[PDB]
Amino acid sequence: RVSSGRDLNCVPEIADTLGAVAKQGFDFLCMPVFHPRFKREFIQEPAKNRPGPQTRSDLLLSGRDWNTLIVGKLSPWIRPDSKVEKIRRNSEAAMLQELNFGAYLGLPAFLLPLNQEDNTNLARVLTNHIHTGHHSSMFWMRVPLVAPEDLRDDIIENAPTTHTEEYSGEEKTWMWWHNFRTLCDYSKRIAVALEIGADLPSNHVIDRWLGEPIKAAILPTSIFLTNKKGFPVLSKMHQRLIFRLLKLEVQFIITGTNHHSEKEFCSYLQYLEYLSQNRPPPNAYELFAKGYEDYLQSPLQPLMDNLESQTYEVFEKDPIKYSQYQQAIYKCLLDRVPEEEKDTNVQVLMVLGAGRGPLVNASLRAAKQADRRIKLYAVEKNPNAVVTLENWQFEEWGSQVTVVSSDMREWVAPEKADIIVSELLGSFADNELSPECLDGAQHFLKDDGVSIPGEYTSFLAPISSSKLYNEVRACREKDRDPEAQFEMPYVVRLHNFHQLSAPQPCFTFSHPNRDPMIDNNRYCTLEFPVEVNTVLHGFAGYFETVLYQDITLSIRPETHSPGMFSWFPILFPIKQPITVREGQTICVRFWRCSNSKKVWYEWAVTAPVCSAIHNPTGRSYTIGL
Amino acid sequence: LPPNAPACMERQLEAARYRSDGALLLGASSLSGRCWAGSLWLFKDPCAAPNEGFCSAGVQTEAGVADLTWVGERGILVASDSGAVELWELDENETLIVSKFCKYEHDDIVSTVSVLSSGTQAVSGSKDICIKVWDLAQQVVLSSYRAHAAQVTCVAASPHKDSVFLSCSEDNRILLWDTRCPKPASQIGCSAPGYLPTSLAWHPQQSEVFVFGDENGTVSLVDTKSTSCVLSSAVHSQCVTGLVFSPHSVPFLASLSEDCSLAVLDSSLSELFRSQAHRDFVRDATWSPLNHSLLTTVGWDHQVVHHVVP
Numbered sequence: 001r002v003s004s005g006r007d008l009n010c011v012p013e014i015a016d017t018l019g020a021v022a023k024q025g026f027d028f029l030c031m032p033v034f035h036p037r038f039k040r041e042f043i044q045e046p047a048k049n050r051p052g053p054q055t056r057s058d059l060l061l062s063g064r065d066w067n068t069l070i071v072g073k074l075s076p077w078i079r080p081d082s083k084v085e086k087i088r089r090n091s092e093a094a095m096l097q098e099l100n101f102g103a104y105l106g107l108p109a110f111l112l113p114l115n116q117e118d119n120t121n122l123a124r125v126l127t128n129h130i131h132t133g134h135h136s137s138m139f140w141m142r143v144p145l146v147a148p149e150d151l152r153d154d155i156i157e158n159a160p161t162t163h164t165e166e167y168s169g170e171e172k173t174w175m176w177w178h179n180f181r182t183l184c185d186y187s188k189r190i191a192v193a194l195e196i197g198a199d200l201p202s203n204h205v206i207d208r209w210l211g212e213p214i215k216a217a218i219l220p221t222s223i224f225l226t227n228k229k230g231f232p233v234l235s236k237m238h239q240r241l242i243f244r245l246l247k248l249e250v251q252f253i254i255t256g257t258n259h260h261s262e263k264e265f266c267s268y269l270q271y272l273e274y275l276s277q278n279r280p281p282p283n284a285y286e287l288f289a290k291g292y293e294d295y296l297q298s299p300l301q302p303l304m305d306n307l308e309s310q311t312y313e314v315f316e317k318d319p320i321k322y323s324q325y326q327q328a329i330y331k332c333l334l335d336r337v338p339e340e341e342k343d344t345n346v347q348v349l350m351v352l353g354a355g356r357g358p359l360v361n362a363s364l365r366a367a368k369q370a371d372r373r374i375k376l377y378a379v380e381k382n383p384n385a386v387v388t389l390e391n392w393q394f395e396e397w398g399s400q401v402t403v404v405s406s407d408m409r410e411w412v413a414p415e416k417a418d419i420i421v422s423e424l425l426g427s428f429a430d431n432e433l434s435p436e437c438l439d440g441a442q443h444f445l446k447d448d449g450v451s452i453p454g455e456y457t458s459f460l461a462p463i464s465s466s467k468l469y470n471e472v473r474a475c476r477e478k479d480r481d482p483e484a485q486f487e488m489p490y491v492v493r494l495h496n497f498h499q500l501s502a503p504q505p506c507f508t509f510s511h512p513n514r515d516p517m518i519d520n521n522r523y524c525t526l527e528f529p530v531e532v533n534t535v536l537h538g539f540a541g542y543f544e545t546v547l548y549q550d551i552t553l554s555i556r557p558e559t560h561s562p563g564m565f566s567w568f569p570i571l572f573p574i575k576q577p578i579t580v581r582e583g584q585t586i587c588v589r590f591w592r593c594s595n596s597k598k599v600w601y602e603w604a605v606t607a608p609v610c611s612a613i614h615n616p617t618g619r620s621y622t623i624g625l
Numbered sequence: 626l627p628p629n630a631p632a633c634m635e636r637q638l639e640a641a642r643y644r645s646d647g648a649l650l651l652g653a654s655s656l657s658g659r660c661w662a663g664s665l666w667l668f669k670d671p672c673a674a675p676n677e678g679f680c681s682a683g684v685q686t687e688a689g690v691a692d693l694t695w696v697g698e699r700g701i702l703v704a705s706d707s708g709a710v711e712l713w714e715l716d717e718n719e720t721l722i723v724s725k726f727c728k729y730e731h732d733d734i735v736s737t738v739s740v741l742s743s744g745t746q747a748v749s750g751s752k753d754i755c756i757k758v759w760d761l762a763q764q765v766v767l768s769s770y771r772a773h774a775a776q777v778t779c780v781a782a783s784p785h786k787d788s789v790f791l792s793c794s795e796d797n798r799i800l801l802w803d804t805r806c807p808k809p810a811s812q813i814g815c816s817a818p819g820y821l822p823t824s825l826a827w828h829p830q831q832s833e834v835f836v837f838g839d840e841n842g843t844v845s846l847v848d849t850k851s852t853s854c855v856l857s858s859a860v861h862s863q864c865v866t867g868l869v870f871s872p873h874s875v876p877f878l879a880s881l882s883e884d885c886s887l888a889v890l891d892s893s894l895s896e897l898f899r900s901q902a903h904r905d906f907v908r909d910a911t912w913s914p915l916n917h918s919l920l921t922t923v924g925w926d927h928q929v930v931h932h933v934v935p
């Protein structure tokens with residue numbers, strides 16, 4: 001269910017407080033490490049020589065408690081950005097002092113406010129703490145959805161609250177976070193604690209946070225309504241936000257005093273538990289795809305590489321995919337042998353990349369469904385898999401199946417095919433070089449022959465995710481280009497992100513390819529109208545294929561094949577994030593390039609500003625031929 | 626130590642307030658060590674403070690005391706770290722101090738309380754950014770205002786007007802309130818935005834002038850009427866924490882700072898006296914009602930100092 005904690009700014013005895021909040025059902029406690037009112041002097045005598053102790057002893061909890069149950073809080077008098085020089089100097093010293101103490105205690109996180117626009121000196125001081133010894137602990141930057149200045153009651157006669165529509169102004173708190181994090185150069189240790197108020201802002205203002213590293217959501221007691229039986233509860237819209245935040249699996253923090261008295265603080269908490277246990281329970285995909293969220297993987301290259309036995313296991317574990325293939329072959333057979341010919345006419349069906357044989361079996365199930373006669377070839381270059389095929393053809397298929405252990409581009413067929421069937425497709429359709437493989441094989445398809453699939457089309461959509469940008473960035477490796485990470489696609493269950501525009505088709509391929517001169521290179525230009533303010537971090541890729549007539553496969557979200565878990569989305573990063581303003585168009589350029597040896601993608605953003613061309617010459621990433 | 630009185634008094638002396646009869650109210654917090662709590666003390670011999678076994682009454686508070694005020698002659702209204710305003714009642718004999726109400730209405734440290742000229746209402750301020758108006762008799766919040774955009778530093782009730790008080794905040798606003806107006810708050814202060822305001826005191830006679838102190842050690846004399854900044858002197862080398870007017874006909878201004886010094890100023894904000902006696906932060910000042918030349922300061926150095934002001 002839910003991981004949640006108590007925020008307090010009063011701890012008389014840390015023993016009792018912790019027990020109490022544990023008793024109440026909290027997983028952890030956010031509290032000061034020094035007394036919030038205990039302003040300290042570092043420079044001026046006499047205050048400087050204030051006899052210690054400066055705070056309460058580390059001996060008061062176990063190492064294990066400090067490690068797991070406690071989040072620290074910067075003292076609220078500490079103002080590194082004060083315009084008063086002496087306050088700035090003491091606030092630097094005190095911020096260091098307090099951060100160093102959290103680190104001494106081995107606290108797993110430490111809360112710091114972004115409660116105004118200028119946090120430059122705060123950023124500078126935090127970045128220094130981070131660049132003093134490599135540690136794991138997190139900084140939770142406490143940012144409001146809505147600036148307190150824009151939340152204030154309209155009760156100052158000579159200083160009224162402006163009610164003029166304010167698109168950018170209502171997003172100012174995101175800019176506070178954005179600027180702070182940019183100064184701190186996207187440290188993986190700096191994340192967001194999103195503080196939520198009674199007034200939810202516009203949905204555009206909430207949308208600003210879609211791709212951001214939110215670790216916690218702070219819920220004041222204030223924002224809870226009361227129901228008839230006096231229980232604390234939340235507005236339908238507060239509930240919607242909570243549901244959004246549960247999907248992002250953040251930790252919830254309850255702050256402020258009890259405003260529902262003849263109820264404990266577990267009443268707030270039980271409400272949250274109530275909402276999580278009462279969420280739409282996860283579909284099959286959402287459970288399959290669960291552990292894989294924002295996890296970057298190399299795209300498979302099953303041409304250049306021999307896939308492992310367990311790789312084929314998981315391909316085979318997607319029945320919806322093979323139902324579709326059965327059905328496409330089913331339909332194609334009936335179209336090709338009339339009932340009066342069923343028994344005199346036997347169709348040569350060649351599986352091209354047969355792996356351990358599920359396409360062969362589907363072809364078999366299809367023919368007995370169609371009550372038509374089929375001769376199979378099962379062509380596979382991975383000789384490890386050929387082992388599985390040949391044990392199958394001996395023990396089960398018998399001689400209806402000729403297993404061919406060769407490359408389809410090289411194989412000399414004893415005869416031509418009525419139908420070729422292939423599943424040579426990656427998450428970006430042509431990224432496994434299905435075009436080149438099928439081009440090489442097409443000379444042995446009969447002049448009236450069907451390829452299944454007949455067609456595939458790749459799609460791109462620009463995305464915002466500071467989370468994924470940071471994950472890519474952290475894939476630097478010794479003994480290559482320090483920026484190579486950014487010039488290669490990743491397969492990933494895209495999760496913490498914002499789609500900035502509807503996907504658009506990128507590259508399309510047709511089989512058989514009639515072209516007199518066939519050329520599988522490509523140059524596409526795409527314009528993505530963007531209706532928000534945002535930061536572009538890369539392009540989600542998806543694909544659609546026509547197996548046969550109306551039978552298709554898709555991971556394109558708008559047309560996703562339902563309950564098919566094969567093929568996560570692909571992600572083209574860019575080296576430098578690009579600010580985009582509501583109304584602006586993102587223009588991206590993609591090339592498919594090749595030698596005799598290798599095929600690769602190059603890409604450039606050309607609007608609202610230009611990127612570098614990514615992966616020029618295939619220097620960071622290529623697909624082997 | 627009387628019945629119900631702690632053997633030991635928390636180190637950080639936060640509040641000092643003479644009653645009419647010359648008896649001394651002390652608030653103190655524990656701002657360090659294992660236990661972060663606080664205490665209330667009555668010293669009918671003011672020369673015996675801060676020593677705990679020469680006290681008329683004393684008691685332990687759950688949490689630390691951020692601010693203090695007398696309510697008449699037996700009431701103590703308390704701004705807690707706990708987010709509670711708490712009303713402590715004196716004893717008949719006046720030998721113990723006993724909780725009358727303790728209300729958890731603020732979401733953060735209660736930083737500031739003031740009793741309104743009424744005597745039956747008070748206004749608290751808090752780090753939760755709100756200002757609340759209290760019926761003391763009924764033990765409830767009548768009003769609650771989110772006027773400000775940062776934590777509230779000071780709230781000071783007008784001497785003679787039970788609907789009027791000042792507030793100031795790190796949002797750099799000084800607010801003149803009047804609860805009779807549908808929009809009660811009016812933003813007041815100098816021409817240019819200057820340094821955050823830290824302390825407020827109404828002139829005890831002219832209830833349309835007050836002084837504020839800022840975080841840069843300047844004390845400033847303001848006229849609500851001309852709504853412009855009359856006089857200001859740079860009195861302190863650190864934030865001005867408290868401003869206290871003497872009981873005198875033409876009253877003297879006691880100025881306390883985190884620079885650990887006391888200044889006493891005339892009406893024109895000129896320097897008369899100054900005391901380095903303290904070697905930590907100076908927290909409060911009260912003038913003896915009995916001897917108007919006596920000025921009593923407390924500090925975090927746990928010194929109770931009696932000043933003779935010439």
Ligand SMILES: CSC[C@H]1O[C@@H](n2cnc3c(N)ncnc32)[C@H](O)[C@@H]1O
Nearest residue numbers: 302303353355380381382407408437
């Ligand atoms: C089922 S995943 C695709 C399969 O096609 C096989 N394959 C890929 N390219 C070729 C090729 N050119 N010739 C024969 N088999 C291929 C791979 O080894 C893999 O088992």
Ligand SMILES: CCn1c(N)nc2cccnc21
Nearest residue numbers: 300315423424425426566567
């Ligand atoms: C079995 C089809 N397939 C290919 N060719 N690449 C894949 C990657 C993920 C899932 N299925 C895949």
